Amino acid sequence: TNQPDIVHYLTENAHKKADIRRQDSRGNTVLHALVAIADNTRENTKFVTKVYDLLVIKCVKLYPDSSLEAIFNNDSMSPLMMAAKLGKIGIFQHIIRLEIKDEEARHLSRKFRDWAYGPVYSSLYDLSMLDTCGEEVSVLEILV
Amino acid sequence: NRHMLFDIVSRGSTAELEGFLPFLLAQKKRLTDEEFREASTGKTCLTKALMNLNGGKNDTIPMLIDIAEKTGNLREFINSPFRDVYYRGQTALHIAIERRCKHYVELLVEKGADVHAQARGRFFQPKDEGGYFYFGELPLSLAACTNQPDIVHYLTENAHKKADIRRQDSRGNTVLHALVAIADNTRENTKFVTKVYDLLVIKCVKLYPDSSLEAIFNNDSMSPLMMAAKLGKIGIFQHIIRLEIKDEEARHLSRKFRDWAYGPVYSSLYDLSMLDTCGEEVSVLEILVYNSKVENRHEMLAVEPINELLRDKWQKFGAVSFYISVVSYLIAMIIFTLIAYYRPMDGTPPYPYRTTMDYMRLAGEIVTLLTGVVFFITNIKDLFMVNSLFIDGSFQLLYFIYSVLVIITAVLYLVGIESYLAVMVFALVLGWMNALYFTRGLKLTGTYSIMLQKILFKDLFRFLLVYLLFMIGYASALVSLLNPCRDSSTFSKFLLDLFKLTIGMGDLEMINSAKYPAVFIILLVTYIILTFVLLLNMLIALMGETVGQVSKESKQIWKLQWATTILDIERSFPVCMRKAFRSGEMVTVGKRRWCFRVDEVNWSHW
Incomplete structure (x- = not known):
């Protein structure tokens, strides 16, 4: 509903909290619904990137052991793996360009900065799911 | 520590x-x-x-x-x-x-x-x-x-x-x-x-x-x-x-x-x-x-200056270098006319060359044949490694066919067959009719058909070589079928009957279509299909070219080749004639240099 104010209220609560890791009958978490409602318009690519950054940092701060991206579906699909199926671009280009400036949630950032000798910047992208060497299925395979 | x-x-x-x-x-x-x-x-x-x-x-x-x-x-x-x-x-x-x-x-x-x-x-x-x-x-x-x-x-x-x-x-x-x-x-x-x-x-x-x-x-x-x-x-x-x-x-x-x-x-x-x-x-x-x-x-x-600097030497070395190219082609034609009409024509080539008035036309074969040789070898090297400023790119293909018929003519009176006289006067008719491309003048506005005629010259020469190597290769194939003795004079008879089928003369010597009818047709039907697709490879290479990048590139290489040729004309002159038509003037500024004058029109700055 483009409303983080209930998201502030559901996660912290003196009565009962809201589990972010909870799936559904389709085995989809809170991130997969953001991919399903994602559209390639101007407005819808804006706030979904705001919520996607908000939930993962809140997931690390409440639970430092696991990441919210690690949980798969009934088809064993990450939110990066799902965005190639439905063909959604704005949520795809944000997960790839993921550089989180919260140092407690640093260890899952995707884009890095190696060295900057003035005019030359040395970015760094991870191939954790792009070229699966000995795994089940890749991002690039489902792209094709 | x-x-x-x-x-x-x-x-x-x-x-x-x-x-x-x-x-x-x-x-x-x-x-x-x-x-x-x-x-x-x-x-x-x-x-x-x-x-x-x-x-x-x-x-x-x-x-x-x-x-x-x-x-x-x-x-x-x-x-x-x-x-x-x-x-x-x-x-x-x-x-x-x-x-x-x-x-x-x-x-x-x-x-x-x-x-x-x-x-x-x-x-x-x-x-x-x-x-x-x-x-x-x-x-x-x-x-x-x-x-x-x-x-x-x-x-x-x-x-x-x-x-x-x-x-x-x-x-x-x-x-x-x-x-x-x-x-x-x-x-x-x-x-x-x-x-x-x-x-x-x-x-x-x-x-x-x-x-x-x-x-x-x-x-x-x-x-x-x-x-x-x-x-x-x-x-x-x-x-x-x-x-x-x-x-x-x-x-x-x-x-x-x-x-x-x-x-x-x-x-x-x-x-x-x-x-x-x-x-x-x-x-x-x-x-x-x-x-x-x-x-x-x-x-x-x-x-700014190079757009006008290239127009300086084009207005001085353009019409001069073009008119020499028209005359120097006419020199190579009048030499070849004196060769053809002065042959003794007995029927047994070649000829005794001791006669001084026949030694003169012997020098004409040095001039005419070698010019066809240089144009033949350099274009094949240029293919592996269309200057339509002066003469459009359709001439380079036609002058190539002129260059092919000269070196074929040079073989025929050295083999001993006196039928060289047909082909020799044949290229004489084309050469005077190749002068009809001289009447256009000079071209400076670039069209889109200029880049097209490079690929036209590129693949038709590939079309001729894929033809002739196939005709020789299939004729040399059929000699290998001849296990009993066969004769070395049969290969001249295979290649003679093989050329006539593509034209349709139907005057053959060995290959009888009544002998194997069901095989001669299906080789000839597939021969049409092989040739019809190679004709369509010409048109698709042209239709696939005239859509996207021809709107920019035809106004790029035409500007590039206009600059490329005028410097090749500049390298042709010696150092003595270089200082004669040098552009620019001496204008004494400050406490004198060879600068160039450029005019402007402006209404806003005062």
């Missing part, structure tokens, strides 16, 4: 480094010792101090000089370059300029710093050599590459030691050549490089009025104007050409001038000092055509 010392400098806490100056008095250890320096690269404490910065400020930086002062290494602890190979030659002076510590650049030189240190490492090479960034290995050139004139104000004037602007590197490049190497055709990078290029030359004249900074060449004898044509950089190119300096002490090297302004008409003036080198080594315009392989050469020829 050493490991605690290399850490706390990055921590930036001088209270955790106290008492170390009396500690070196006991153990007599210098700061530039082996254990007080990284064993792999040579990274020292001061170099580590400048990498990790606390907002660009580390208080150990005057303190590391303080401890080095009591040991007596002020010209050593600062001037110790890197010992490695990949980051070779980089000092602490290179790092402080890099991270823009203007307060700390002043601290290094006042305590004693080598200004002329060269960072000649493999990393500091250009991208063709394997490095990632190039600045000409000089800290004065490095400050110009960081878009920072503030160090350039500090290095040039200094009470301790100044910075020589004229200093080269191991590649022989000065401070201007590094600005050309870092130049990019973006919006931001074309801005400040023009600001630094004006700043350095005026400062070079004010400090040294005798010489100009543009005069110093490279190891390849290249000026900064000569270098920008090699790497194909436009923004630094268009600023050196449009160079009008309003500092009157540095007036005598300005490029653009203002002759007279009678209201709406402005009279600009561009110098041809390097654009048309009359008696010098190599020119700007020559490297724009003969050497530059950059894609931006079409835009770079569209600068």
Whole structure:
């Protein structure tokens, strides 16, 4: 509903909290619904990137052991793996360009900065799911 | 230990480094010792101090000089370059300029710093050599590459030691050549490089009025104007050409001038000092055509003076060189007419050549045949490795067919068959009718069909070779079927009957279609299908060409070939006739040069 104010209220609560890791009958978490409602318009690519950054940092701060991206579906699909199926671009280009400036949630950032000798910047992208060497299925395979 | 010392400098806490100056008095250890320096690269404490910065400020930086002062290494602890190979030659002076510590650049030189240190490492090479960034290995050139004139104000004037602007590197490049190497055709990078290029030359004249900074060449004898044509950089190119300096002490090297302004008409003036080198080594315009392989050469020829400089020599060497080409073709025709009509024609070629009046026409076979040989071999070499300015590209295919029939004719009277006379007079009819392409005149407006006729000439010559190698190959195949004895004169009969089937003469000698009817048809049907697709490969290569890029490229190569041919005409004349029709005039400006007059019309500026 483009409303983080209930998201502030559901996660912290003196009565009962809201589990972010909870799936559904389709085995989809809170991130997969953001991919399903994602559209390639101007407005819808804006706030979904705001919520996607908000939930993962809140997931690390409440639970430092696991990441919210690690949980798969009934088809064993990450939110990066799902965005190639439905063909959604704005949520795809944000997960790839993921550089989180919260140092407690640093260890899952995707884009890095190696060295900057003035005019030359040395970015760094991870191939954790792009070229699966000995795994089940890749991002690039489902792209094709 | 050493490991605690290399850490706390990055921590930036001088209270955790106290008492170390009396500690070196006991153990007599210098700061530039082996254990007080990284064993792999040579990274020292001061170099580590400048990498990790606390907002660009580390208080150990005057303190590391303080401890080095009591040991007596002020010209050593600062001037110790890197010992490695990949980051070779980089000092602490290179790092402080890099991270823009203007307060700390002043601290290094006042305590004693080598200004002329060269960072000649493999990393500091250009991208063709394997490095990632190039600045000409000089800290004065490095400050110009960081878009920072503030160090350039500090290095040039200094009470301790100044910075020589004229200093080269191991590649022989000065401070201007590094600005050309870092130049990019973006919006931001074309801005400040023009600001630094004006700043350095005026400062070079004010400090040294005798010489100009543009005069110093490279190891390849290249000026900064000569270098920008090699790497194909436009923004630094268009600023050196449009160079009008309003500092009157540095007036005598300005490029653009203002002759007279009678209201709406402005009279600009561009110098041809390097654009048309009359008696010098190599020119700007020559490297724009003969050497530059950059894609931006079409835009770079569209600068202001060269669009009119190429029209200068075209109006003087265009119609003259074209009319000689018409006459020199007519000379080769009248020679061939005297060969054909004066043959004795007995029926047994060749002929006795002792007769002097028959020795004269023997020289005609030297002239005519060899011209067809040179045009035959060079175009095949040009195919593996269409100048429609003068004569359109349909002539080059037709003159090729003229060139093919000459060398076939030369074989036939050397074999011994007297039927050479049909083909010899046949090409004579084409050659006079090839002169009908001379009546167009001269073309300067580019059409889209010009690039099309290169591929027309390309694949039809491929279409003929895929024909003839197939006809010879299939005829040589059928001789291998002949296991009993067969005769070597059968191969002439296979190839004779094989040519007639493609035309449809139907006058054969061995191949009887009534013998094997069901096989002769299905080979002939598939022969139609092989030839019909190769005809469609012509049309798809044309239809797939005239859609996307022909709207730009036909107004690029036509501009490029118009510049390419006129310099090939320029190389044809000797050095004596070169000075005759040289464009440009002598206009005495200041305290005289061969510049070029350009007119303007403007209504806004007053």
